[PDB]
Design a protein around this ligand. Structure first.
Ligand SMILES: C[C@@H](O)[C@@H](C(=O)O)[C@H]1C[C@H](SCCNC=N)C(C(=O)O)=N1
Ligand SMILES: C[C@@H](O)[C@@H](C(=O)O)[C@H]1C[C@H](SCCNC=N)C(C(=O)O)=N1
Ligand SMILES: C[C@@H](O)[C@@H](C(=O)O)[C@H]1C[C@H](SCCNC=N)C(C(=O)O)=N1
Ligand SMILES: C[C@@H](O)[C@@H](C(=O)O)[C@H]1C[C@H](SCCNC=N)C(C(=O)O)=N1
Ligand SMILES: [Zn+2]
Ligand SMILES: [Zn+2]
Ligand SMILES: [Zn+2]
Ligand SMILES: [Zn+2]
Ligand SMILES: [Zn+2]
Ligand SMILES: [Zn+2]
Ligand SMILES: [Zn+2]
Ligand SMILES: [Zn+2]
Lengths: 267, 267, 267, 267
């Protein structure tokens, strides 16, 4: 008779695991992840900040790219996160061990991070990663500063309860560039209506679309670059087709509304 | 020359520490705390629920009152909290050790509970208690059920980020009684405007007044009974002067608005 | 060019995942795991105790077997562990959520359990499971009692730093049966000499052999039943070939000594 | 009638809270705590290490002394601990928040640190401090290295289960100085025999005396300086009367043996 099933690993498209060399986004800001997963390094006079790490197996690659940018492991001061899913916060535990960086995150992200993504509201235990602890709990609108560069958190719950957009002002050609690293707005296979683990899910998504629309936003980036129409693999032309924050929110809301109607129609 | 100061203990008015016998609120619901701190025991066919415990030194008294109600330590199934301050969640750690109960709380309450109230947004380390872990993380509107009795969480952030109202329907004289255990709405010594640790504090308070106004509410109780005009010490007449949810929110908002104007005026 | 590798799942022999009906070990003690992974249910007048859960996907099966024994989910009071590896503590998180049980474990087991087995001294992140929190920290020789049945912890570090043997006295045919649930003594692929993550590994193993030899031991069981020569699949004859504690320790030490000499010889 | 008692604060002798200027112990090692509580700063080419912090209210003073030594808050890389009691690990949480340092500690110290000293085996909740998380779990004999300086952990359980001695080799006048920072060996008000929370307490103390005797030890320091006969307040003559490791262990064992006999005699 049938044995219980084997555990199944969280697998992803090859391009999500495809290393790339550092790609400059603005004067201090570099994409140092893979072709299809964002990991942003911001370099200051007093150390580096990392926003997202991608998948768990990307830890070594990120350190290699940091070294290419002149950042030794001990020079990484701070890790910030969009949300605590395996494909964005995957390597946080290993990075903390190997760099001495601290993690700052809101309470929702902190508790999910500390479970390693287990008991996810929608995924259960299917998509997990090594747990990590948040060292600083931040609140909506709170400013985290490293080397004079100020990062502001904007809560946009939905994709996870702790979903966060991070904004900061870099420069390029002597002009300020307000960067918005806006979190995911997808609801992949989620039950949207009457979800007992997330009763106000629809209300949170709706508010989060409005939050993204209003972000200070000269240049938008997203945890999955295709969501904001970036193409990291083409190098200097990677940002050419990037969406505004307005267009990113609009596309996400239209997709959400269609999914909601399909759920009412049983599919 | 001066040595560093001694540590100072969190002290409270004597009435907050004054034991009282169990006082029935509805058919299954009892106040079993002290004269001036609420701790509600709800007794079901499949075990008891405790909402708040008061101060840390109240653990033994609560167990005594539980025994008077026929509830042995192992019969306590679940602990719920208004918010994770020393005067309401004080004895949670000891109760968990001595009863085997689980704690359910939202992510904000969970992270503050696990710090024992340390690094409080407003109090720093001045008001602390033994840390405890939440066993179940709950979301806004989520229903927690014990022995058929359904408790619904309503987030009302402000007094703490994790502040929660809990509602449930008990009975009395054959009629349903919608009980609302609404959290504190005070801002004791808080900086309200431009607080770097709580940038959206005013917006959260304002939304929380509206949340309390709309709660299902035949009978209101509050962590400090005087806030809803209860007088536990008079026994059967204790509820006579109790406020509605509408009046509790209105009084709290007027107090908040006055405090905000005083803050603008430097006091 | 090559993408980074996909994550690989922890897979096991089919027999480790092969459900079995409850098999009585003594008057109150039942094997309720799979054919090749031990999970012991001890049933008292005041609730049940579970020693080990096996693999993460065994949670539902264990609850089914508990129901067959008359134990509802809420009747499980306590979970004890041999050691916090995925194949023995795998389902602890889910069991806690679904039963309200508490976990008691020593500090080493607690910290590994709370990492979900990640950053293992020998396995790294290769063999992980959903993290869980210990509710009671126990010390060497400490007695944990449920329904009058006393379980004593005997630390036997080596296989993991937190490896524990649990002993208790059951009955059979009116006579006492001193049961010893002794932890694993294997060192699967471990570096034994000069291991920077475990400098006293050899000394701990050597002491643990002596600890096992001296356990009160009328009947020995082990997390992998083949280690003590049990054959769960044959039912009433399952214990016939079981080893004494003396013989289990002797076999383990001889295997360890041979492995140590092979390590010196480069293999 | 009597209300429940007020919470009582952990108070200490004034000299434990008496700031002192940095006192050099060897070429890289400085006492930067108070007159009667040790806090050792070791300064390397790649950042500073702190061994113990003393009481919770010493955080600001330690940062002041670090600045006097040329160490900015961000230059503190690592915190090590003798044991996780309020008078030695008191300010760890605040130091981590303000410096970005990581904490390394064994599993026993980690779990007590994360409880803020609550549920102490002997003190209960009477002596607590803000909880902090360990970032690196270390094993007996494990080496932690910063800026080329190697610190070795030597477990000496007794005063707490996680009690640790730390050793390292500094220099003075061109000659190596093997420093031993040996933990406390007192048992203040402890029940020694048949303690249900610590059944092997006597055996652990006895082994720990032998451990201290065998430490590499040209210069001994202790968390309470009087325990090793230091007098921090006299400056350059502070080390003159310091005990050897042999004499520290001998004095502690004689005190322990006398206390044990007194316990048998009921006092
Ligand atoms: C665990 C999931 O959240 C993860 C997965 O499928 O593995 C993906 C699914 C959506 S959308 C990704 C669409 N791909 C490229 N744009 C998502 C996100 O929006 O962050 N991550
Ligand atoms: C730590 C503080 O939050 C605590 C204290 O002062 O000790 C009190 C202050 C306010 S209002 C209490 C007013 N007293 C009676 N109604 C408050 C609450 O609203 O929960 N608790
Ligand atoms: C993660 C490992 O610890 C696990 C595995 O290989 O998957 C096994 C290896 C050894 S020995 C098991 C031998 N099999 C049957 N007797 C072991 C144990 O002794 O607990 N578990
Ligand atoms: C909480 C206790 O551990 C603490 C206290 O009494 O406040 C002291 C008592 C002993 S011995 C201290 C003796 N004083 C000077 N040598 C001790 C130690 O050995 O670490 N700390
Ligand atoms: Zn995601
Ligand atoms: Zn994603
Ligand atoms: Zn409060
Ligand atoms: Zn209060
Ligand atoms: Zn194992
Ligand atoms: Zn195993
Ligand atoms: Zn101490
Ligand atoms: Zn001390």
């Amino acid at each position: 008779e049938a044995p219980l099933p084997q555990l199944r690993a969280y697998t992803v498209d090859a391009s999500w695991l495809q290393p790339m060399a550092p790609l400059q986004v603005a004067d201090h800001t570099w994409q140092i992840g893979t072709e299809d997963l964002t990991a942003l390094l911001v370099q200051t006079a007093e150390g580096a900040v990392l926003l997202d790490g991608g998948m768990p197996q990307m830890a070594g690659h990120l350190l290699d790219n940091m070294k290419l940018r002149g950042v030794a492991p001990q020079d990484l001061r701070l890790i910030l996160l969009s949300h605590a899913h395996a494909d964005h916060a995957g390597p946080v535990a290993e990075l903390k061990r190997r760099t001495g960086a601290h993690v700052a995150a809101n309470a929702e992200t902190a508790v999910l991070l500390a479970r390693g993504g287990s008991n996810d509201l929608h995924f259960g235990d299917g998509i997990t990663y090594p747990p990590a602890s948040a060292d600083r709990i931040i609140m909506d609108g709170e400013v985290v500063t490293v080397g004079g560069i100020a990062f502001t958190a904007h809560f946009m719950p939905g994709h996870t309860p702790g979903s966060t957009a991070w904004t900061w002002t870099d420069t390029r050609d002597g002009k300020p560039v307000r960067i918005a690293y806006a979190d995911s707005l997808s609801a992949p296979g989620y039950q949207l209506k009457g979800n007992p683990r997330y009763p106000r899910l629809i209300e949170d998504y709706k508010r989060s679309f409005a939050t993204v629309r209003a972000l200070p936003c000269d240049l938008l980036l997203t945890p999955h670059p295709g969501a904001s129409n970036w193409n990291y693999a083409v190098g200097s032309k990677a940002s050419a087709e990037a969406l505004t924050c307005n267009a990113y929110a609009d596309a996400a809301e239209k997709k959400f509304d269609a999914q909601l109607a399909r759920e009412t129609a049983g599919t």
